[PDB]
C-alpha cells in the first residue's frame, strides 16, 4: 500500500520501518522475494516506479542482509526463474540478478561493474 504508491519519504520510511521491525523474522526473506516476484514478474500490470522501488528493495535487502533468509530466498527465486533451461522471464531474471548481484557484492576485478 505504502512503498509502491507512497511518497519518497513515506516510501523510504515504510521500507526502513519494515526492516527495523520485521527484518529479523524468518519469513522476511520470503517476503522480499514474494514482493520481487509479484511486483517485477512480467505478468504484473501495476504501474509504479520500478526503479525507485527497486532501489528501495536493494537498500532493504542490504539492511537485512544479516538475515540468512534474504539471500537464500532471492537465489531460490533465481533458481526457479532459470528452471526452464534445465519459459524464461528475462526481465524478471534481470531484476532478480541485479538485486542479487548488488546484495552479494556487499557480502576488485569486478569493480568495473
Amino acid at each position: 500500500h505504502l512503498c509502491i504508491s507512497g511518497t519518497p519519504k513515506i516510501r523510504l520510511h515504510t521500507g526502513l520501518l519494515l526492516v527495523q521491525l520485521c527484518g529479523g523474522e524468518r519469513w522476511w526473506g520470503q517476503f522480499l522475494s514474494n514482493v520481487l516476484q509479484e511486483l517485477y514478474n512480467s505478468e504484473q500490470l501495476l504501474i509504479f516506479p520500478q526503479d525507485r522501488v527497486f532501489m528501495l528493495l536493494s537498500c532493504i535487502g542490504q539492511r537485512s542482509l544479516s538475515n540468512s533468509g534474504v539471500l537464500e530466498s532471492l537465489l531460490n527465486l533465481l533458481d526457479n526463474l532459470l528452471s526452464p533451461l534445465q519459459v524464461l522471464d528475462i526481465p524478471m531474471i534481470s531484476w532478480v540478478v541485479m538485486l542479487v548481484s548488488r546484495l552479494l557484492d556487499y557480502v576488485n576485478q569486478w569493480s568495473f561493474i
Binding site: 512480467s42 504501474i47 520500478q50 526481465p91
Partner: protein, 70 residues
C-alpha cells in the same frame, strides 16, 4: 476556476503520455535515450504540473484566509 482549468490542462497533456513497460530491449533504449518528442512532452508536463501545484497552494491559502474570516 483557474485551478480547475489548470488541472484540466494536466489531464489533457497526460492523456497523450504513454509509459512503456520495462520488459524489452526496445523499452530499455527508450529509457536510455529519451527521444526529443518524449523530452518535449516531459517539459510541457512539468510546466503544466507546476501550474497545478502553485494553484493548489493558493486555493488552500484562499480557503484558509476565507476560513479565518469566517
Amino acid at each position: 476556476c483557474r485551478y480547475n482549468l489548470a488541472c484540466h490542462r494536466l489531464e489533457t497533456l497526460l492523456q497523450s503520455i504513454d509509459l512503456p513497460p520495462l520488459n524489452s530491449a526496445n523499452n530499455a533504449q527508450y529509457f536510455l535515450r529519451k527521444p526529443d518528442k518524449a523530452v518535449e512532452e516531459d517539459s510541457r508536463v512539468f510546466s503544466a504540473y507546476q501550474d497545478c501545484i502553485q494553484l493548489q497552494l493558493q486555493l488552500n491559502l484562499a480557503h484558509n484566509a476565507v476560513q479565518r474570516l469566517k
